[PDB]
Amino acid sequence: AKIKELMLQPERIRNIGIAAHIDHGKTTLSDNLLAGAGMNAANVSMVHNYEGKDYLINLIDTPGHVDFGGDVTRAMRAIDGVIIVVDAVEGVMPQTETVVRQALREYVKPVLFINKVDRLIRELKLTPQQMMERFSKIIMDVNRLIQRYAPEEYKKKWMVKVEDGSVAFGSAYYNWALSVPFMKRTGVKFNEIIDLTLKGDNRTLRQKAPLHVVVLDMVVRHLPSPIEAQKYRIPHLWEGDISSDIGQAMLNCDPKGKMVMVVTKIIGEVATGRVWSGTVKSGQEVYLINTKRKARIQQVGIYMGPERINMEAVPAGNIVAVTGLRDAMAGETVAEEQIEPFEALHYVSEPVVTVAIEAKNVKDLPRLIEALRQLAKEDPTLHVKIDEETGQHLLSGMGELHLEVKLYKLKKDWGIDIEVSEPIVVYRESITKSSPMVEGKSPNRHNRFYIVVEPMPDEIYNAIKEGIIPEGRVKNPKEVAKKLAELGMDYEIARGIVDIYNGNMFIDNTKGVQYLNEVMDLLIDGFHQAMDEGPLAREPVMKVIVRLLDAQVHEDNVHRGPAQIYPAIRTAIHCAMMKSNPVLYEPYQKVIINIPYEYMGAVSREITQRRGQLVDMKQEGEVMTIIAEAPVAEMFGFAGSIRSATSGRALWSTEHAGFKRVPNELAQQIIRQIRQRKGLDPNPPTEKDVCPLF
Amino acid sequence: LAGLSALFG
Ligand SMILES: Nc1nc2c(ncn2[C@@H]2O[C@H](COP(=O)(O)OP(=O)(O)CP(=O)(O)O)[C@@H](O)[C@H]2O)c(=O)[nH]1
C-alpha cells in the first residue's frame, strides 16, 4: 500500500523472466505466482518478503516462439535472471534446450522449476523414487546444457543445485511448491504433498507449501540484483567502451550518472522499458539514438501488480512505462549522450509477401477489415486492401510466419477458421542502363514531354530508403540537391529535383518552359502512376531516375487536364524503361540462424539449396550463429526444413535485406507467371508494344 | 542430488 520507495536500493530489485515450452505452465505459473503475493501484458511487478527484507521483483513478458529470434532474444536480455519451467510429465525438450541457450547467452543466471508434479502423483501414478529419478534426470539434462553453453567463468557455479534450493518442484495450478530450503524452514517434505494431493485436500496444500513463497525465495536467494548483474552483463550486452563515464553508469547501476534506458515493448500509446543508468522524469530531453527523430515524455510511471501506476523520478535498475514516444521501436536505445545503441540498426523495411483470405462463415462479413486494420497499425509493416468486396483482401507483410501468426489471430482469438491463398512474393521492376530520350505526347497533341530514365546508383537509393534522403515531394530542393551531390551526382542535375517516390525520383532539368509549373503536379501524379505498376508485369518500380529534359506546355488549362498530362508522361516513362533494358527485382532476407555446431553443415546445405549464400558467421564456444542471405521466393517452408535439419534446436529470424536483380534465366519464367496470376497475357510487352510508332 | 533424497522422507 506504500512500497514505491524500494527502487532507491538496487540490490533488492530482481529483473527476471520465465522461460517455458508451451502448455508447460508459464502463463498459469505467472498468474498464480503474483496473485499469490497479493497484487499478454508488458510487465507485472510483485513485492515479496524474504528473510525479513522486502524485495521488488520484476516479472517481464517473455515470448518463447523459437521461430522468432529477435523478440525472444530482446526480452531475455531485458531480464537479469530466468526461471526455466519444465513440465515434469514431458521433461526437457529440444525447444527448452533452445530458450535456455538464449537465456544463458546474454549472461542471464538460471533457476529450474519443475512444474505439473500433481500430474505425476494423481494421473501418472508414480512411486516416490520414480519421481526422484525423473526429477534428477530433468535436473541433469539442464545441467549438461549449463555445462555446454555457459561462459567459461560460469559453467560449474551456474549449475542448478537441488540441495541449495536453486531447483523448486511443484504445481502451478494448485498453488504449491517445495524446495529444500522451504523444507529446512517448514519441515514440509514430499510425503505430505503427495498425501494431501491424493486426498484432494488442495486448500491445506495451498498454505502448507505455498507456490509464490517457495519460488520467489528461490528467485531472491539465487537470481541476481541489477547491480549484481550489470557488472558482467553490460560488457557482453553491446560493443561500447567501458572507460566512458557512462560506462560505469551502466557497469554498476548508477542513478546519478547520465540516464540510459531501452524499450522492451510497446502498447493510449505506452512504452515499457528498462532503465540502465540515471533517472527519468517527465519532460527532460531524449535523443532516440537511431530512430531519426528525438523527443520527450508526457507521462512517466511504474508497475504495481498488473496495474499501470503513475510516478515521476525513477532510478536505474528498474522497469518503467513512459508515453509520448512517437516512433520508438521494440529495442529502442533511449539516452542523451549520443552513443551507438545496444543492438544493430534495424531497417524499417517495406512489406514483401502477400496472401489472399476468405471467411468460411458468411456472418463474419461486417468489419473484419478494421480488426485486421487494428493489427495493420499495430504492426506498421502490414498493408491491406480496405473496403468493398474483392474476395476478400490481400494481407501483405514481412514473411510467411509473420502473416500466419496473424492467421492464428484469425482464430485463436476472434472466431474464424480460415482459408488462405498460397503466398505470393512482392516483386519489383527496374532498369539496367540509361535510355535514349523519349517523347510523351498528350492525346490532344498539345502538350509534349521529353524525358530520359536512368538506373539509380545504389548509394543514392540506399540514401533514400535508410532515410538520409526523404520520400515525398521535395520540400527543400536546395538542401536535398547537396545531399545528392555528395553521392556521385551532378549538382546541376540534382538541383532540379522535384519528387521522391518509393525508391525513385523525378527531376526537372528544363530551361524556360512556359506554363510547365501549371502541369508539374499532374506530371508528378503521372510519374507516381508510372511507378505504381511497371511495364513488365505491372509490379512496383524501384531505382529509377526520371529526368524531364524539355517540354512544350499549352497556354490554356482547357487543353491540359489530367486526361492529357497523365498518359503522356506515364507511357513516356514506360517506353523509356523498355528501352533501358528493364529487369525484375526480388526481395531478399537476412537469415540469422543460431545452432549447436553439430548441425552446421546441414544448415549450410539447406541455405545452398534455397539459392542462399552464407554471409557471416559468429561463434561463441559450442553455440554457432550463421548469417545468410536468401531470396524470399525460395524461403517458403523454411521452419520445417530447418527444424528437421537441426532437430528443433535452431533458433532463427529474418530481417529485410533489400531487393536484388532476378537472374535472366529465371526472370522470364517468373515474369510470365506473375502476369499469368494477374490475369494478363504471359508474354511481357516489349518496347515496340509500349512505345508509339513512327 | 543428495538433497533431492532428503525431500523424500
Ligand atoms: N495438472 C497440472 N496442470 C497444469 C499445471 N500448470 C498448468 N497446467 C495446465 O496446462 C495448461 C496450459 O498451461 P499454461 O499455463 O496455459 O501454459 P502456457 O504458457 O499459457 C501456453 P499458451 O501460451 O498456449 O496458453 C493449462 O490448462 C493448465 O490447466 C500443473 O501444475 N498441473
Side-chain angles (χ1 to χ4, degrees):
Chain A
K2 171 34 173 63
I3 206 55
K4 345 302 173 184
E5 74 174 304
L6 297 155
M7 73 182 52
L8 307 43
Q9 334 187 359
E11 205 134 38
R12 292 194 184 318
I13 300 278
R14 290 297 195 285
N15 290 322
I16 68 175
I18 299 172
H21 181 304
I22 158 160
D23 306 281
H24 268 207
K26 147 165 148 177
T27 47
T28 306
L29 168 65
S30 320
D31 292 343
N32 295 17
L33 254 182
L34 257 31
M39 312 270 195
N40 328 90
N43 178 48
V44 154
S45 77
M46 221 35 83
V47 61
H48 171 68
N49 189 331
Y50 178 69
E51 294 196 341
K53 301 166 169 179
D54 309 328
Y55 296 79
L56 168 64
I57 307 189
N58 269 307
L59 184 285
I60 304 159
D61 182 9
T62 302
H65 316 339
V66 284
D67 310 328
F68 279 31
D71 300 15
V72 180
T73 307
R74 177 146 320 183
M76 262 188 317
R77 26 206 188 89
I79 73 174
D80 308 326
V82 62
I83 308 177
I84 306 168
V85 167
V86 186
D87 188 334
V89 187
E90 264 196 46
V92 171
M93 297 286 257
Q95 162 183 2
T96 52
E97 277 170 70
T98 61
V99 294
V100 170
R101 268 198 324 258
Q102 322 99 15
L104 160 161
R105 107 205 162 282
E106 296 294 328
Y107 290 81
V108 176
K109 182 183 167 192
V111 284
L112 180 38
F113 172 57
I114 316 184
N115 182 21
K116 281 175 171 189
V117 179
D118 58 324
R119 251 199 166 136
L120 288 192
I121 300 164
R122 324 193 299 162
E123 273 201 33
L124 291 216
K125 158 207 167 267
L126 294 50
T127 86
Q129 240 220 295
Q130 297 179 324
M131 309 202 309
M132 303 196 43
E133 293 183 354
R134 161 158 308 198
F135 283 178
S136 62
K137 120 139 181 179
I138 289 188
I139 293 191
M140 167 195 292
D141 285 6
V142 170
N143 276 341
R144 323 175 278 197
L145 277 43
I146 308 190
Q147 211 179 319
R148 207 181 171 198
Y149 312 121
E152 167 89 320
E153 46 274 30
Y154 300 143
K155 321 183 263 174
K156 184 168 32 229
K157 327 228 166 178
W158 263 20
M159 315 206 88
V160 297
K161 213 146 143 59
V162 42
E163 49 266 84
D164 82 342
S166 47
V167 183
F169 316 77
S171 171
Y173 186 40
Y174 294 97
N175 303 262
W176 71 262
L178 181 58
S179 64
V180 317
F182 183 95
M183 143 175 174
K184 231 172 181 302
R185 152 185 137 185
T186 59
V188 196
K189 328 187 103 169
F190 265 82
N191 312 4
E192 341 188 9
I193 285 114
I194 307 191
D195 207 66
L196 271 50
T197 306
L198 280 170
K199 294 195 184 66
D201 188 9
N202 298 326
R203 35 165 145 130
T204 309
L205 192 26
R206 172 125 179 156
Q207 63 177 24
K208 253 254 181 178
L211 185 56
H212 78 85
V213 170
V214 187
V215 167
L216 296 176
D217 277 13
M218 180 170 56
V219 169
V220 178
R221 179 158 177 182
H222 293 286
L223 295 189
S225 146
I227 184 164
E228 252 305 340
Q230 290 185 290
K231 173 180 179 230
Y232 61 87
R233 280 209 96 205
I234 80 164
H236 177 72
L237 279 165
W238 125 265
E239 182 190 59
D241 76 33
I242 172 161
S243 41
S244 310
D245 41 36
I246 334 168
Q248 294 80 3
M250 303 190 303
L251 199 288
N252 76 344
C253 180
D254 193 289
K256 55 205 86 176
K258 153 165 125 210
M259 101 168 301
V260 176
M261 80 163 199
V262 164
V263 172
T264 68
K265 262 190 158 48
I266 190 63
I267 310 307
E269 99 200 326
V270 181
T272 305
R274 176 186 172 164
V275 176
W276 296 98
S277 65
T279 299
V280 71
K281 10 299 170 183
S282 88
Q284 198 90 256
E285 270 205 342
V286 321
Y287 293 65
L288 317 176
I289 291 296
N290 295 152
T291 319
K292 99 212 162 295
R293 302 229 245 190
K294 318 294 178 182
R296 248 332 206 102
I297 296 173
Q298 278 17 185
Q299 246 316 146
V300 146
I302 210 165
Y303 292 97
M304 184 171 71
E307 305 130 309
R308 216 154 22 200
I309 192 200
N310 324 93
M311 321 211 319
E312 296 314 328
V314 41
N318 280 275
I319 311 307
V320 174
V322 297
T323 190
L325 276 300
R326 159 46 176 190
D327 210 44
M329 305 207 168
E332 241 293 338
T333 312
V334 171
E336 182 20 48
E337 172 293 342
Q338 36 272 315
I339 41 177
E340 181 177 9
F342 276 81
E343 65 304 39
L345 274 85
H346 193 328
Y347 190 120
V348 180
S349 101
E350 323 132 83
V352 285
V353 300
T354 299
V355 297
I357 318 88
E358 335 209 316
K360 46 170 292 193
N361 273 244
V362 287
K363 144 219 172 170
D364 316 298
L365 60 329
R367 244 171 187 128
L368 180 48
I369 59 103
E370 265 299 308
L372 63 66
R373 224 159 182 102
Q374 305 178 355
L375 295 193
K377 121 131 184 171
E378 136 68 4
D379 174 350
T381 56
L382 269 58
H383 295 0
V384 350
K385 268 200 155 28
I386 188 67
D387 196 40
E388 70 263 354
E389 160 61 26
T390 68
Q392 218 315 11
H393 320 110
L394 68 319
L395 193 45
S396 293
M398 295 316 299
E400 171 163 32
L401 296 187
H402 182 188
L403 292 179
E404 105 155 28
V405 164
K406 322 305 268 196
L407 271 42
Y408 181 62
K409 110 171 296 187
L410 267 275
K411 193 221 277 225
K412 92 188 165 195
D413 184 33
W414 295 63
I416 325 176
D417 300 332
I418 203 69
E419 178 251 343
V420 311
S421 71
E422 280 202 313
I424 62 165
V425 161
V426 180
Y427 283 87
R428 288 181 180 178
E429 313 194 17
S430 188
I431 49 175
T432 198
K433 62 189 177 183
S434 305
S435 68
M437 176 164 79
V438 185
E439 176 187 51
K441 292 192 295 183
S442 42
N444 64 16
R445 285 195 198 168
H446 293 131
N447 311 271
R448 302 182 181 79
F449 302 98
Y450 302 86
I451 69 163
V452 289
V453 296
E454 297 170 333
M456 190 186 284
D458 319 278
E459 305 74 3
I460 303 176
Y461 178 75
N462 293 352
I464 295 186
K465 281 187 175 171
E466 34 197 48
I468 312 168
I469 303 179
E471 298 276 340
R473 179 83 163 248
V474 167
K475 58 182 178 180
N476 199 337
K478 42 158 182 37
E479 171 68 16
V480 178
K482 214 88 201 199
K483 197 81 193 176
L484 288 103
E486 302 191 355
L487 289 325
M489 170 161 177
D490 178 21
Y491 187 78
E492 220 55 17
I493 286 177
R495 69 185 333 194
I497 182 73
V498 184
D499 187 276
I500 307 279
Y501 192 79
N502 294 328
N504 313 283
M505 56 182 53
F506 189 95
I507 308 176
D508 180 12
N509 296 149
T510 56
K511 315 146 195 311
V513 181
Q514 217 197 348
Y515 305 117
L516 180 60
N517 52 339
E518 307 290 350
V519 306
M520 185 55 82
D521 284 339
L522 289 185
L523 281 178
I524 299 308
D525 290 338
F527 170 62
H528 290 181
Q529 282 169 22
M531 302 290 107
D532 286 345
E533 309 196 14
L536 257 33
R538 292 187 172 206
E539 294 287 64
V541 181
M542 60 167 285
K543 251 173 74 175
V544 177
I545 303 166
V546 182
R547 301 186 18 245
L548 182 56
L549 300 188
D550 202 7
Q552 175 168 5
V553 186
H554 188 84
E555 55 176 15
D556 195 313
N557 167 67
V558 81
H559 291 132
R560 309 188 319 251
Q564 310 262 357
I565 308 313
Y566 290 172
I569 179 68
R570 160 183 57 241
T571 75
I573 297 177
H574 277 205
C575 174
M577 291 182 66
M578 295 296 319
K579 298 183 171 320
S580 318
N581 188 228
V583 304
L584 191 50
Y585 270 51
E586 65 186 324
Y588 276 64
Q589 288 174 324
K590 180 186 198 199
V591 186
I592 321 179
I593 303 173
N594 184 309
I595 47 161
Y597 83 82
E598 328 84 11
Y599 300 112
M600 296 189 228
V603 165
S604 167
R605 146 171 278 180
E606 270 288 5
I607 279 173
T608 293
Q609 307 282 15
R610 291 175 177 266
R611 280 202 294 121
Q613 201 161 51
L614 318 85
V615 164
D616 194 30
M617 203 159 293
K618 200 235 185 170
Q619 190 164 25
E620 301 169 19
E622 298 182 33
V623 78
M624 190 76 256
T625 305
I626 295 186
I627 303 185
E629 287 178 344
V632 176
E634 280 290 12
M635 282 292 289
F636 288 108
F638 186 74
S641 290
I642 199 59
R643 89 178 46 245
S644 150
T646 65
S647 302
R649 306 185 155 63
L651 171 292
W652 68 287
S653 62
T654 59
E655 303 181 356
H656 183 232
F659 287 77
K660 305 183 197 305
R661 180 166 105 98
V662 179
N664 303 356
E665 313 80 341
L666 187 47
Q668 315 307 325
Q669 309 175 4
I670 298 292
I671 299 188
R672 282 184 261 109
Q673 324 183 350
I674 308 184
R675 287 179 65 75
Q676 250 161 334
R677 180 206 111 213
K678 294 213 192 168
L680 284 29
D681 306 279
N683 275 338
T686 174
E687 59 160 79
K688 314 266 269 172
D689 318 317
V690 176
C691 311
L693 289 199
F694 55 93
Chain B
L1 296 176
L4 189 70
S5 58
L7 290 173
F8 298 79

